[PDB]
Amino acid sequence: AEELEEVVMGLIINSGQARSLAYAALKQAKQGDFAAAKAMMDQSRMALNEAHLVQTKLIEGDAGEGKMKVSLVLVHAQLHLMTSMLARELITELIELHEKLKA
Amino acid sequence: AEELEEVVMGLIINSGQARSLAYAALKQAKQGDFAAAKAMMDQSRMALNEAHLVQTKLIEGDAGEGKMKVSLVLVHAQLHLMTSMLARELITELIELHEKLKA
Amino acid sequence: AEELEEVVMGLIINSGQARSLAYAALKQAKQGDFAAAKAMMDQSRMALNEAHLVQTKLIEGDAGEGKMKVSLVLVHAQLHLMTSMLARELITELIELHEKLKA
């Protein structure tokens, strides 16, 4: 719907940007730039945190009537956010491995 | 609905616990504890397997009328389970890498 | 529905095959076969690309009436595709690490 629909687009874009930043963070690690990787990861998380917070309000205050479940719309947003958050967390682990290797 | 709704909560919690155990398993690997990591991974999988089995019954025996597809509710459960299973599988790979590194 | 339902099954199978190929690609890397890993990854991506293209047509040309959003059915397909694509991308990163790790 109006906002919910426009809000989802923002969430999808935000989630996509989060992943983009995360992959970029990893790329920095490959170049041996741990400092930039850490900075990129930190920002990536903040983007996700804000996105997750918005989704939480939706999931909690969404359902007009009773039930708390979710909606077709929310599920789509959750899919992007869940994927992005997971990607970012795993990417963080991958970056840590690069540090252990040396570079 | 009654059970389905309560069942989903259990699945979501179970999926979340699965991931939690998986991340913890990885943490053990970082401490150089391959034995504990393996034990944690094994338990993580068992939790997922039981969760997946419940979802399968849902997906197969859910749809009251004809169609086998899924439902708004099932999709949400699948999202958590799919994310958790994938996370756990990737985490397993990450742990194996730690073993190859040494520690 | 008829096609959409049958199309989803194809997408789910394709997504599953994509992941299967990706994991197999990783396995090749463990055996120290970077050439086979690369070949498997390339094919995995092509499978996903074709799958993603089909989903795009669905998401863009699906909704019979106005709205572009998604449908219960599409979300399910997106879940598998999103999971598979992410898995494959992360697996690619994991394979690159194996190459850096010698073998």
Side-chain angles (χ1 to χ4, degrees):
Chain A
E2 294 114 69
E3 277 156 83
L4 301 185
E5 188 174 81
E6 202 175 347
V7 171
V8 175
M9 180 177 263
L11 290 170
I12 292 167
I13 292 168
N14 209 353
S15 83
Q17 300 229 351
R19 188 188 298 166
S20 219
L21 292 165
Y23 276 67
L26 172 62
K27 186 175 181 178
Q28 298 278 332
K30 291 183 179 181
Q31 316 220 334
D33 289 349
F34 298 116
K38 252 172 136 62
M40 294 288 274
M41 298 216 313
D42 214 41
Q43 294 188 356
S44 234
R45 185 174 217 165
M46 253 152 96
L48 295 171
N49 214 312
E50 182 175 79
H52 183 359
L53 282 168
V54 171
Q55 164 144 54
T56 337
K57 265 176 181 177
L58 293 170
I59 296 171
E60 278 207 344
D62 161 66
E65 294 188 66
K67 294 158 263 302
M68 14 63 203
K69 253 118 62 47
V70 289
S71 81
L72 192 109
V73 171
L74 300 170
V75 176
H76 191 255
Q78 219 173 8
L79 173 56
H80 291 290
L81 291 169
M82 286 291 280
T83 45
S84 285
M85 182 159 94
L86 193 77
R88 191 258 143 164
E89 288 195 29
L90 290 167
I91 288 167
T92 294
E93 300 288 357
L94 283 159
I95 291 171
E96 178 122 25
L97 281 167
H98 288 87
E99 183 176 12
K100 291 184 179 182
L101 278 156
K102 261 178 102 324
Chain B
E2 294 114 72
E3 277 156 83
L4 301 185
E5 188 175 82
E6 202 175 347
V7 171
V8 175
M9 180 177 263
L11 290 170
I12 292 167
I13 292 168
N14 209 353
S15 83
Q17 300 228 352
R19 188 186 306 166
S20 219
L21 292 165
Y23 276 66
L26 172 62
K27 186 175 181 178
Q28 298 278 332
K30 291 183 179 181
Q31 316 221 335
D33 289 349
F34 298 115
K38 252 172 137 61
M40 294 288 274
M41 298 217 312
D42 215 41
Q43 294 188 356
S44 234
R45 185 173 217 165
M46 253 152 96
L48 295 171
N49 212 313
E50 182 175 78
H52 183 359
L53 282 168
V54 171
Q55 164 144 54
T56 337
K57 266 176 181 178
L58 293 170
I59 295 171
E60 278 207 344
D62 162 67
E65 294 191 66
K67 291 159 267 302
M68 13 64 202
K69 254 116 63 45
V70 288
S71 81
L72 193 108
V73 171
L74 300 170
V75 175
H76 191 255
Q78 219 173 8
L79 173 56
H80 291 290
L81 291 169
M82 286 291 280
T83 45
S84 285
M85 182 159 94
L86 193 77
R88 191 258 143 164
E89 288 195 28
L90 290 167
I91 288 167
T92 294
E93 300 289 357
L94 283 159
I95 291 171
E96 178 122 25
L97 281 167
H98 288 87
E99 184 176 12
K100 291 184 179 182
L101 277 156
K102 265 187 84 345
Chain C
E2 294 114 73
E3 277 156 83
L4 301 185
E5 188 175 82
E6 202 175 347
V7 171
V8 175
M9 181 177 263
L11 290 170
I12 292 167
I13 292 168
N14 209 353
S15 83
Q17 300 229 351
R19 189 188 299 166
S20 219
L21 292 165
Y23 276 67
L26 172 62
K27 186 175 181 178
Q28 298 278 332
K30 291 183 179 181
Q31 316 221 335
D33 289 349
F34 299 114
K38 251 172 137 62
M40 294 289 274
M41 297 215 312
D42 214 41
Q43 294 188 357
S44 234
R45 185 174 218 165
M46 253 152 96
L48 295 171
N49 213 308
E50 182 175 78
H52 184 359
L53 282 168
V54 171
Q55 164 144 54
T56 337
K57 265 176 181 178
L58 293 170
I59 295 171
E60 278 207 344
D62 161 67
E65 294 191 66
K67 291 161 268 302
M68 13 64 202
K69 251 118 63 48
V70 289
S71 81
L72 192 110
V73 170
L74 299 170
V75 175
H76 191 255
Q78 219 173 9
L79 173 56
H80 291 290
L81 291 169
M82 286 291 280
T83 45
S84 285
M85 182 159 94
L86 193 77
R88 191 258 143 164
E89 288 195 28
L90 290 167
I91 288 167
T92 294
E93 299 289 357
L94 283 159
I95 290 171
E96 178 122 25
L97 281 167
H98 288 87
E99 184 176 12
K100 292 183 179 182
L101 276 160
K102 253 193 101 332

